[PDB]
Write a protein that binds this ligand. Structure first.
Ligand SMILES: O=[N+]([O-])c1ccc(O)c(O)c1
Ligand SMILES: O=[N+]([O-])c1ccc(O)c(O)c1
Ligand SMILES: O=[N+]([O-])c1ccc(O)c(O)c1
Ligand SMILES: [Ca+2]
Ligand SMILES: [Cl-]
Ligand SMILES: [Fe+2]
Ligand SMILES: [Fe+2]
Ligand SMILES: [Fe+2]
Ligand SMILES: [Fe+2]
Lengths: 359, 359, 355, 351
């Protein structure tokens, strides 16, 4: 349905940064700097520019004060200056609105293209960026919960196959997905950089941003973030986890920022860089697909996500999903999940695993 | 109202082993040896004797084939042979049924006393035991989920203060407890060996055995147990966790054996051996008391526990708790819990944390 | 000095496997399978095919029984079948000897090109491989010391700049190197897959294979390999480490197999896939460059390395390095190293660090 | 030959703190607070009082400014107030010089006895201490290298059997030791609290303090200390390790403070609380006894240790060991070690 352009796709390296609009800059700074330990590249009254421990580009996260909390841009770094021109030509052929600024939208980025993509998401493509001190061996700064890299984005969109085809044409390869036996796709993960993903599509009303993910070196680092949140008496901001994912095999945690933007902390997924990397499809009823240990997925994880902005800074209208809901088919009234395919024992009918039901 | 005897209490070193009755020895062997990796000290068609990686006494766990799965004995090692005689005189003065075997009740234990204690529990006291090869440096055998020590037992009993007084007279010192503002005690932890506990009392219908706990060296060892259970497609036997406890500060997991006996895997609590070790009392509505990260306690954790046997091998009758239920006051339809005392933000009314209600 | 071909370079994805000739297949099996826990994809009385925990291609390591212990092939996977034709045309234009087999040289590999490259190393390029069960979630098999991926090779070669230019034309990017203030290069690391390296050049007499490196998930996994080696009373096969590397920032261990083939266990380097990834150059006298904690590098690590074979299976003649020796300039009799640049305190004259 | 008093021994709970004299308080503070992340219980211009993450007593370490860097006191907590009276009567009977301060020698400690013990070491015994906030769940303060408990001391003394018997009389039990076939004891580890040790005796010239040890939760915490020292470009102050010990089975690291006091960071030894805990004896020539991975023990680890003070603050005179030297019999010119007993492959001679 989204046609393959004749113009060549830009060569995308990786997810690079997200610009999030936040309502109280000081409160958000306390979360991202004082709680999570991200490193300040620049700040003023209106914006905070943050980077992870191993990053050498100017930032992985820009926090921009505004009236309505939202994703303003998810940004991908491209291989060459010329790929920014390629991006503009490709999205113009797709019929999308685009904006080009030769000196960047945010500080520390040069020539950049922002687009309203066909799924309603504000993507940025850039090559030029101000390099900064790469802090990877600054163990004098290293925190017990240190965030070392930006890893991925996760986007909520109503029609996953439509989005998946478009991202494949753009050069992302699907590594894993969740489907059922009736033709429905609930989620797909897709990459450029050779990890399980750079972005992912989650079926639901959208466009909305599900989360931004940062990695740690080790599992104990994620444990420490939880432990610190308990010490700060903000354990109510731990949404889900910690856990082992089935999809991706990573150890993970989901937490919520002061504007309810969801952040994932993630570690130890696998290499996907080979072009015939085997695609893994999980059945939506498999209770080990999202949490390998079977722990239930809280309903807010399926229903809540961040607004996204258009190029004018207005909120994008939400389009309802008409395909089946993962929540409904797994933990809802008519839901079903299994631990062992075909075994009634360890199965759940109309409720979540481990003795819980939907609140 | 359990009187303090005139006879001197035995000097108790530590929890040493449990004897659990199991209905299918081979299935229980698969769980304890093949899944959990405990080391066999002796086995035949009737029993399997198991020890942890660091142990030098003959065993920490005896699995005994029988018709009805239950706790048959929870054993404490005493400091000298003469302390077994002290235990005998002590329980005789309490008016408890005792049985003394100069030869032992199980293999690898010598002179031993079993008693039906005033809370209905089968306690064993012994000094003499057959030493075995201490495996602590056998890294050729070490598994990714290695269980290194037996840490503690946890007992369900209807009246926590009655039991705690009796354990205090036996020499156990309370480290932590859970109470409400109108004077109900829900749980207490108490020790002899300088950790948070050797045994613990959980308010509920009793006598029942809540769990037996083993330690690991590190937190990743507990994560591996979960990961392994997912790979074996037995994630439905992971009851609760992993997590960080509030009480004890230990990293933990609860799993269920083939007869539903609950096993805890635990690591990294703190030193309590000083006699003025500061006690910690938690409020029952504090949602960080059990899981520090605020994750909900699954209802089965509060309701399900193993039968216990009397000295004839018959199941002890259960007495109902009349004080308030922890489940009901925290996650039940009339329950409540808080993240920050006094704050409605992050508080839960009539349901569990994180968005679940009771299934 | 090695010219850049007009023919396009093959698109190389990553290092994929090594073929090692070993002299006692049973002793080598005990080391790589029983001690290190690698997984057997295939075996017979002449060869063992092994793979790491997260691999889906047929193997990462082939142990081949033979009379002389040596590297027989270092193999890189290329992006398409057509890239094996590109590699062929490229090495022909370099004037290198090549051999192409549509059915592969070893089991589980299809159409493959082997070459004696300009530095005397036996390189293999392939696309086609037999997929196997990816064991990445088989935590029922997971060892406390589990090796999860093949990470890189390290090659000993007398002239590093000469080598570096050749690998860069082949599409490898230098991420880190070791130089001095007198124009000598002692080592360079270079990548395709976006980690610090897929191969590396260590200045010394060659061609010889320094080591093959496998990864673990976490640092405790490397600690366990050491602990296990102590329990098996084979701690004498631990050569160096464990440690933190300066170059790469990875946590590491060097151990020796039964034929003295050196294996590195490695974890937690950083992302290098951006094209302007900043290059890091260490000074050869910086005593934190190889072991970040300043632990001394044992002379065997500099002097010992594996023989390599040509396409006929004969040992390649060793060419002597005439540029300065990293050993001599840092820990030899007239050696020097520093902890802090310009500070006499914490410096070492004519001896290794730490006593 | 140290006679056992008739007076009963105090009941010692555990090693509790050390008082180290340091020459530059600000440099020392940098090391112990900014590098190692110990928590300040009290400070002024003459002393810094520090504690570990899980401690509730006032401190584990006192840094006192003075002209000569030395150990001033190694303090053990006793079970009751009356055990301080017992310690006084005990050491008086031993013929040792003692000093009782009913209000303590350092802040945060109450009634305390200091003694010049029969091996020349300044021991303190106290019960009363000011309790402080136990930081064990303050994960907002937790460092990647966090020191969680004080674990033990290690004393260098010339005659190990002589000091071992004295410590056994005091209620310490030996858990491990190092011996040769000829009957020489080179080291012994002994405990009260149910870990491998609260103190240890190293054969060498003494009295000198070999080290004070702190524990971490996990091995990665020790790795981080090393990584941090690399980043601060003070890797020259890493003396030995990190490693797995043979004796104790603990993961370890040894580092040097600005006055060359040696600090060990230590984790994951085993339980010794049972009275028939099996004692392990290693052969001095076994190359896995000290570092299990067979890494060499740098000679400075055997020859360097801190001076100790007497009760007047003067340096205690040193007595030179006449028994065989572990350095000499293993890495000296006529020394040797093995990986596997009886096997020349993996053995080391004069090296
Ligand atoms: O916080 N609780 O759930 C606890 C704390 C420690 C335990 O050993 C336990 O079984 C429960
Ligand atoms: O710093 N060096 O010693 C290095 C760095 C990375 C390596 O993989 C290696 O084999 C050596
Ligand atoms: O094996 N040794 O070298 C040891 C073992 C334990 C220790 O605490 C120590 O300081 C030295
Ligand atoms: Ca269906
Ligand atoms: Cl998920
Ligand atoms: Fe994600
Ligand atoms: Fe427990
Ligand atoms: Fe390497
Ligand atoms: Fe020590």
């Amino acid at each position: 349905e989204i046609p393959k352009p004749v113009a060549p796709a830009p060569d995308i390296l990786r997810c690079a940064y997200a610009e999030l609009v936040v309502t109280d800059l000081a409160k958000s700074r306390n979360f991202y700097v004082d709680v999570l330990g991200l490193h300040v590249s620049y700040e003023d009254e209106n914006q905070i520019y943050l980077r992870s421990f191993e990053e050498f580009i100017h930032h992985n996260l820009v926090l921009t004060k505004g009236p309505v909390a939202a994703l303003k841009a998810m940004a991908f770094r491209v291989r060459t200056p010329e790929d920014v021109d390629k991006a503009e030509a490709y999205y113009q052929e797709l019929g999308c609105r685009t904006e080009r600024r030769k000196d960047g939208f945010v500080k520390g980025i040069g020539d950049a293209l922002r687009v309203e993509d066909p799924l309603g998401f504000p993507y940025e493509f850039f090559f030029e960026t101000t390099h900064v001190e790469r802090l990877h061996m600054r163990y004098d700064l290293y925190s017990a919960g240190e965030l070392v890299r930006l890893d991925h984005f996760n986007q909520v969109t109503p029609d996953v196959p439509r989005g998946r085809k478009y991202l494949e044409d753009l050069g992302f390869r699907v590594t894993e997905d969740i489907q059922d036996d009736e033709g429905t796709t609930y989620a797909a993960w897709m990459h450029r950089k050779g990890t399980v993903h750079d972005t992912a599509l989650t079926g639901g009303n959208g466009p909305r941003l599900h989360h931004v993910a940062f990695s740690t070196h080790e599992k104990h680092n994620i444990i420490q973030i939880c432990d610190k949140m308990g010490a700060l008496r903000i354990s109510d901001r731990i949404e889900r986890g910690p856990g082992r994912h089935g999809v991706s095999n990573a150890f993970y945690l989901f937490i919520l920022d002061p504007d309810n933007h969801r952040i994932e902390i993630y570690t130890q997924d696998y290499y996907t860089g080979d072009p015939d990397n085997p695609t893994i499809t999980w059945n939506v009823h498999d209770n080990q697909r999202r949490d390998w240990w079977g722990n239930p997925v809280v309903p807010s994880w399926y229903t809540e996500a961040s607004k996204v902005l258009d190029l004018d800074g207005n909120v994008q209208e939400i389009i309802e999903r008409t395909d089946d809901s993962e929540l409904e088919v797994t933990i809802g009234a008519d839901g079903f999940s299994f631990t062992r395919a075909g075994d009634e024992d360890g199965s759940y009918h109309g409720q979540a695993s481990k003795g819980f039901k939907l609140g």
